Amino acid sequence: NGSENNVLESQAGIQKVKYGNYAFVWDAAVLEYVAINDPDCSFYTIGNTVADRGYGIALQHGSPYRDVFSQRILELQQNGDMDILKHKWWPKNGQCDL
Amino acid sequence: NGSENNVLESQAGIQKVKYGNYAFVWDAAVLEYVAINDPDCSFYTIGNT
């Protein structure tokens, strides 16, 4: 019934993988936030072309400002400004080949 | 069903080639202009006749 192999926390997966014979399935952005910072460079990761989903801001149901933030987000992404702010936390000039 | 390798944008493809472990298939004249103009010139290219 799902109780056999699963875990309740990110640490319970990550450290069980680091110290046990296990693999943990999770959000790739989080796994890369682990793997870039891990001092051993011990982790590597594998993935698939996920589509049609993303992280987004939410507003009150029917809020009139819903378009303004969406437009500014589109501007920031299209300019690469959003990707420059992303590089603050997920740099591509990494030290470990993940 | 093509989900395991492909990408949605050529810019993501080219950067995945630069920093990842991948080979990107595209118009040879464009990839040659990139391979000339990359500031590190880290790329090389091949193509069919």
From Swiss-Prot, chain B:
Ca(2+) 2 binds at residues 38, 40, 42. It comes from the Eukaryota. Glycans are attached at residue 1. It is found in: Postsynaptic cell membrane. Belongs to the glutamate-gated ion channel (TC 1.A.10.1) family. GRID2 subfamily. Tetramer; dimer of dimers. Interacts with EML2, MAGI2 (via PDZ domains) and AP4M1. Interacts with BECN1, GOPC, GRID2IP, SHANK1 and SHANK2. Interacts with CBLN2, but not with CBLN4. Interacts with CBLN1 (via C1q domain); the interaction is CBLN1-NRX1 complex formation-dependent; CBLN1-binding is calcium-independent; CBLN1 hexamers anchor GRID2 N-terminal domain dimers to monomeric NRXN1 isoform beta; promotes synaptogenesis and mediates the D-Serine-dependent long term depression signals and AMPA receptor endocytosis. It is linked to Spinocerebellar ataxia, autosomal recessive, 18: A form of spinocerebellar ataxia, a clinically and genetically heterogeneous group of cerebellar disorders. Patients show progressive incoordination of gait and often poor coordination of hands, speech and eye movements, due to degeneration of the cerebellum with variable involvement of the brainstem and spinal cord. SCAR18 features include progressive cerebellar atrophy, delayed psychomotor development, severely impaired gait, ocular movement abnormalities, and intellectual disability. The PDZ-binding motif mediates interaction with GOPC. Member of the ionotropic glutamate receptor family, which plays a crucial role in synaptic organization and signal transduction in the central nervous system. Although it shares structural features with ionotropic glutamate receptors, does not bind glutamate as a primary ligand. Promotes synaptogenesis and mediates the D-Serine-dependent long term depression signals and AMPA receptor endocytosis of cerebellar parallel fiber-Purkinje cell (PF-PC) synapses through the NRX1B-CBLN1-GRID2 triad complex. This is Glutamate receptor ionotropic, delta-2. The chain holds residues 716 to 764 of 1007 of the full protein.
